[PDB]
Motif scaffolding. Structure first.
Motif, PDB file in Angstrom:
ATOM      1  N   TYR A 152       0.880  -1.198   0.000  1.00  0.00           N
ATOM      2  CA  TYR A 152       0.000   0.000   0.000  1.00  0.00           C
ATOM      3  C   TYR A 152       0.891   1.211   0.000  1.00  0.00           C
ATOM      4  CZ  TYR A 152      -3.514  -3.491   1.292  1.00  0.00           C
ATOM      5  OH  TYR A 152      -4.429  -4.507   1.262  1.00  0.00           O
ATOM      6  N   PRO A 153       1.615   1.531  -1.048  1.00  0.00           N
ATOM      7  CA  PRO A 153       2.500   2.710  -1.046  1.00  0.00           C
ATOM      8  C   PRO A 153       1.735   4.011  -0.651  1.00  0.00           C
ATOM      9  CG  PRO A 153       2.103   1.878  -3.314  1.00  0.00           C
ATOM     10  CD  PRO A 153       1.654   0.786  -2.342  1.00  0.00           C
ATOM     11  N   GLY A 154       2.308   4.716   0.280  1.00  0.00           N
ATOM     12  CA  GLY A 154       1.757   5.986   0.801  1.00  0.00           C
ATOM     13  C   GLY A 154       0.487   5.819   1.576  1.00  0.00           C
ATOM     14  N   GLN A 155      -0.013   4.652   1.868  1.00  0.00           N
ATOM     15  CA  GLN A 155      -1.295   4.570   2.641  1.00  0.00           C
ATOM     16  C   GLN A 155      -1.084   4.051   4.049  1.00  0.00           C
ATOM     17  OE1 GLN A 155      -3.881   2.383  -0.157  1.00  0.00           O
ATOM     18  NE2 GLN A 155      -2.035   2.428  -1.311  1.00  0.00           N
ATOM     19  N   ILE A 156       0.109   3.687   4.412  1.00  0.00           N
ATOM     20  CA  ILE A 156       0.391   3.145   5.770  1.00  0.00           C
ATOM     21  C   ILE A 156       1.009   4.178   6.721  1.00  0.00           C
ATOM     22  CG2 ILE A 156       1.615   1.155   6.947  1.00  0.00           C
ATOM     23  CD1 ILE A 156      -0.559   0.302   5.004  1.00  0.00           C
ATOM     24  N   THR A 157       0.439   4.418   7.866  1.00  0.00           N
ATOM     25  CA  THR A 157       1.015   5.401   8.810  1.00  0.00           C
ATOM     26  C   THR A 157       1.698   4.550   9.869  1.00  0.00           C
ATOM     27  OG1 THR A 157      -0.919   5.368  10.223  1.00  0.00           O
ATOM     28  CG2 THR A 157      -1.125   6.687   8.329  1.00  0.00           C
ATOM     29  N   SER A 158       2.337   5.157  10.798  1.00  0.00           N
ATOM     30  CA  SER A 158       3.016   4.401  11.865  1.00  0.00           C
ATOM     31  C   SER A 158       1.988   3.853  12.845  1.00  0.00           C
ATOM     32  CB  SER A 158       3.941   5.362  12.570  1.00  0.00           C
ATOM     33  OG  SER A 158       3.170   6.581  12.573  1.00  0.00           O
ATOM     34  N   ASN A 159       0.716   4.057  12.625  1.00  0.00           N
ATOM     35  CA  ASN A 159      -0.297   3.531  13.580  1.00  0.00           C
ATOM     36  C   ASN A 159      -0.981   2.397  12.889  1.00  0.00           C
ATOM     37  OD1 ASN A 159      -0.092   5.637  15.584  1.00  0.00           O
ATOM     38  ND2 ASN A 159      -0.999   6.930  14.032  1.00  0.00           N
ATOM     39  N   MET A 160      -0.351   1.843  11.905  1.00  0.00           N
ATOM     40  CA  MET A 160      -0.937   0.712  11.163  1.00  0.00           C
ATOM     41  C   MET A 160       0.118  -0.359  10.924  1.00  0.00           C
ATOM     42  SD  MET A 160      -2.684   2.687   8.007  1.00  0.00           S
ATOM     43  CE  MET A 160      -3.795   4.080   8.273  1.00  0.00           C
ATOM     44  N   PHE A 161      -0.272  -1.582  10.739  1.00  0.00           N
ATOM     45  CA  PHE A 161       0.703  -2.664  10.457  1.00  0.00           C
ATOM     46  C   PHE A 161      -0.086  -3.608   9.579  1.00  0.00           C
ATOM     47  CE2 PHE A 161      -0.966  -6.297  12.907  1.00  0.00           C
ATOM     48  CZ  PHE A 161      -1.557  -5.777  14.034  1.00  0.00           C
ATOM     49  N   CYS A 162       0.591  -4.365   8.785  1.00  0.00           N
ATOM     50  CA  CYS A 162      -0.052  -5.336   7.888  1.00  0.00           C
ATOM     51  C   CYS A 162       0.166  -6.720   8.472  1.00  0.00           C
ATOM     52  CB  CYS A 162       0.568  -5.404   6.528  1.00  0.00           C
ATOM     53  SG  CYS A 162       0.392  -4.017   5.386  1.00  0.00           S
ATOM     54  N   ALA A 163      -0.765  -7.614   8.263  1.00  0.00           N
ATOM     55  CA  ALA A 163      -0.634  -9.005   8.776  1.00  0.00           C
ATOM     56  C   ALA A 163      -1.339  -9.825   7.701  1.00  0.00           C
ATOM     57  CB  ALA A 163      -1.343  -9.213  10.155  1.00  0.00           C
ATOM     58  N   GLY A 164      -0.975 -11.046   7.461  1.00  0.00           N
ATOM     59  CA  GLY A 164      -1.679 -11.800   6.414  1.00  0.00           C
ATOM     60  C   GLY A 164      -0.736 -12.594   5.552  1.00  0.00           C
ATOM     61  N   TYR A 165      -1.228 -12.943   4.409  1.00  0.00           N
ATOM     62  CA  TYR A 165      -0.553 -13.740   3.385  1.00  0.00           C
ATOM     63  C   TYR A 165      -0.541 -13.048   2.016  1.00  0.00           C
ATOM     64  CZ  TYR A 165      -1.185 -17.066   7.136  1.00  0.00           C
ATOM     65  OH  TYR A 165      -1.089 -17.719   8.336  1.00  0.00           O
ATOM     66  N   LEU A 166       0.598 -12.763   1.458  1.00  0.00           N
ATOM     67  CA  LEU A 166       0.731 -12.100   0.134  1.00  0.00           C
ATOM     68  C   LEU A 166       0.338 -13.052  -0.933  1.00  0.00           C
ATOM     69  CD1 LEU A 166       4.003 -10.589   0.995  1.00  0.00           C
ATOM     70  CD2 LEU A 166       1.794  -9.376   0.881  1.00  0.00           C
ATOM     71  N   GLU A 167       0.322 -14.336  -0.709  1.00  0.00           N
ATOM     72  CA  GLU A 167      -0.088 -15.271  -1.809  1.00  0.00           C
ATOM     73  C   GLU A 167      -1.625 -15.171  -1.932  1.00  0.00           C
ATOM     74  OE1 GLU A 167       0.630 -18.162   1.904  1.00  0.00           O
ATOM     75  OE2 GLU A 167       1.289 -16.269   1.247  1.00  0.00           O
ATOM     76  N   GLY A 168      -2.315 -14.638  -0.964  1.00  0.00           N
ATOM     77  CA  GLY A 168      -3.814 -14.518  -1.063  1.00  0.00           C
ATOM     78  C   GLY A 168      -4.537 -15.719  -0.422  1.00  0.00           C
ATOM     79  N   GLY A 169      -5.862 -15.736  -0.411  1.00  0.00           N
ATOM     80  CA  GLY A 169      -6.608 -16.898   0.186  1.00  0.00           C
ATOM     81  C   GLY A 169      -6.944 -16.825   1.626  1.00  0.00           C
ATOM     82  N   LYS A 170      -6.220 -16.106   2.442  1.00  0.00           N
ATOM     83  CA  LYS A 170      -6.557 -16.037   3.879  1.00  0.00           C
ATOM     84  C   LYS A 170      -6.460 -14.574   4.303  1.00  0.00           C
ATOM     85  CE  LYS A 170      -4.451 -20.633   4.440  1.00  0.00           C
ATOM     86  NZ  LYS A 170      -3.736 -20.532   3.136  1.00  0.00           N
ATOM     87  N   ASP A 171      -7.487 -14.009   4.871  1.00  0.00           N
ATOM     88  CA  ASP A 171      -7.468 -12.575   5.294  1.00  0.00           C
ATOM     89  C   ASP A 171      -8.739 -12.222   6.115  1.00  0.00           C
ATOM     90  OD1 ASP A 171      -7.459  -9.523   3.204  1.00  0.00           O
ATOM     91  OD2 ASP A 171      -6.854  -9.754   5.209  1.00  0.00           O
ATOM     92  N   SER A 172      -8.809 -11.041   6.695  1.00  0.00           N
ATOM     93  CA  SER A 172     -10.005 -10.655   7.432  1.00  0.00           C
ATOM     94  C   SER A 172     -10.768  -9.957   6.260  1.00  0.00           C
ATOM     95  CB  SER A 172      -9.672  -9.671   8.605  1.00  0.00           C
ATOM     96  OG  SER A 172      -8.863  -8.612   8.097  1.00  0.00           O
ATOM     97  N   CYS A 173     -11.995  -9.605   6.454  1.00  0.00           N
ATOM     98  CA  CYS A 173     -12.826  -8.956   5.428  1.00  0.00           C
ATOM     99  C   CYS A 173     -13.924  -8.079   6.096  1.00  0.00           C
ATOM    100  CB  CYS A 173     -13.432 -10.092   4.569  1.00  0.00           C
ATOM    101  SG  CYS A 173     -14.047  -9.612   2.935  1.00  0.00           S
ATOM    102  N   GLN A 174     -14.774  -7.487   5.293  1.00  0.00           N
ATOM    103  CA  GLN A 174     -15.854  -6.630   5.837  1.00  0.00           C
ATOM    104  C   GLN A 174     -16.669  -7.436   6.837  1.00  0.00           C
ATOM    105  OE1 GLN A 174     -19.182  -7.097   2.296  1.00  0.00           O
ATOM    106  NE2 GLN A 174     -18.789  -5.193   3.281  1.00  0.00           N
TER     107      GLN A 174
END
Ligand SMILES: NC(=[NH2+])c1ccc2[nH]c(-c3cc(OC(F)(F)F)ccc3[O-])nc2c1
Ligand SMILES: [Ca+2]
Length: 223
Positions: A152-174
């Motif tokens: 997410y270039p330019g969309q991440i602040t220091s109050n955010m972190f990413c967690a998950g799988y870059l290959e896709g298939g597993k993630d949280s959602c709406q």
């Protein structure tokens, strides 16, 4: 939760469902009268449902308590979702036991590679809507800041972190919004946003709770 599994009734005792006539966000119980969720889940008429597993049936252990007040972080920005955290005080205290319990706030931030449990009643399809009746879980690692910012270039602040799988298939959602990211028994994140769900190279973005522990303690202490 996409690619997750059924958690099992009451195995995530700090998970709460925010209900306004239907489940719209998740949250975490941090003491008997306060819940932490995402500021983007704010609305009036919130009933906090504790001890929930199947949200469409009463099966026992549930406690439905109305919210007395919701405190959205004063610096919450809805366009960037920076400071996406909200505290909700309950009208009465919840009865805690083994099925309903609070989760501890972190003493330190977690590092990339830390494995965490993310749970919720959010969508389980990355293309279409399928909402489960019961609570789903997903074990996901916190990613390094370079991978997060590369995603997410330019969309991440220091109050955010990413967690998950870059290959896709597993993630949280709406539907998972506002819920917990617990690593080593500590609440480290709040489900905040992502691009679609379980899409390749688009991991979930979470509110970094370790940056708000003093704010949470000070706000609870004065309300
Ligand atoms: N991929 C993710 N890790 C993720 C996590 C939480 C989300 N919450 C939402 C979300 C979506 C909503 O509807 C919309 F897709 F039309 F924008 C509304 C509220 C949400 O929190 N999308 C989300 C995506
Ligand atoms: Ca139920």
């Amino acid at each position: 939760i996409v690619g997750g599994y059924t958690c099992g009734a009451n195995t995530v005792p700090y998970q709460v469902s925010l209900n306004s006539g239907y489940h719209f966000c998740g949250g975490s119980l941090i003491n008997s009268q306060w819940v932490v969720s995402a500021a983007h889940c704010y609305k009036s008429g919130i009933q906090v449902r504790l001890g929930e597993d199947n949200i469409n049936v009463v099966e026992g252990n549930e406690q439905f308590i109305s919210a007395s007040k919701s405190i959205v972080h004063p610096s919450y920005n809805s366009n960037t979702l920076n400071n996406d955290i909200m505290l909700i005080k309950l009208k009465s205290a919840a009865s805690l036991n083994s099925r309903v319990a609070s989760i501890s706030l972190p003493t330190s931030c977690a590092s990339a590679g830390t494995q965490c449990l993310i749970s919720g009643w959010g969508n389980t399809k990355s293309s279409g809507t399928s909402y489960p009746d019961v609570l789903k879980c997903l074990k996901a690692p916190i990613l390094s800041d370079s991978s997060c910012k590369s995603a997410y270039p330019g969309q991440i602040t220091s109050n955010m972190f990413c967690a998950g799988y870059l290959e896709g298939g597993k993630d949280s959602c709406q539907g998972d919004s506002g819920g917990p990211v617990v690593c080593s028994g500590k609440l480290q994140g709040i489900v905040s946003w992502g691009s679609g769900c379980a899409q390749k190279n688009k991991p979930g973005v979470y509110t970094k709770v370790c940056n708000y522990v003093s704010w949470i303690k000070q706000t609870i202490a004065s309300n």
